[PDB]
Amino acid sequence: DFQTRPEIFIFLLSTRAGGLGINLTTADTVIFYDSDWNPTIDSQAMDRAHRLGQTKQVT
DNA sequence: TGGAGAATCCCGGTGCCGAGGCCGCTCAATTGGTCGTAGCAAGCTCTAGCACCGCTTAAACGCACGTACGCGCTGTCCCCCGCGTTTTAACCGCCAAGGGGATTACTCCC
DSSP: TTTOOTOOOOOOHHHHHHHHEEEEEEEEOOOOSSSSHHHHHHHHHHHSSTTTOOOSSSO
16 A cells, blocks of 8 residues: 555554564655664664655655 | 144255365373382270160050042133234444564563
8 A cells, every 4th residue: 555655645654563564665764753773674674664665755 | 524724844956164084293192211219918905886674754656537628620811822924133244453462572680
């Protein structure tokens, strides 16, 4: 759904269940409302956006 | 006695799902030796269980006889059954949820 249609603004996503898996490359912005103590997991989360096929500069 | 018709049975056909057998493996039953002890055995004590006698009188029995009560009979009526109608909720299927219990991560404390 999120990848299909640009009317959806925001994607709420838990850090561990949601950080690991598939591309989310029609986002452009990643907000850590809270940041994991293990920096790898925040890196995985950031790179669900910052990825091959990423549309725009990730902030 | 007959009959009609409903209700119960039987015969063969269909299919589905669970019973009966196969497979892999664990872990619980078996083999071997140890060691403690309890309960099997021999022995003594004296409890209390069984037997008998004799007496007392309360408890058991056989009988008379009255009447209280068990039982078959009669009448009624009411209320529970057999059957058609109306309706509701039990059953089935499919999706949701939540919860809880085991696991995994990450930090602080020792």
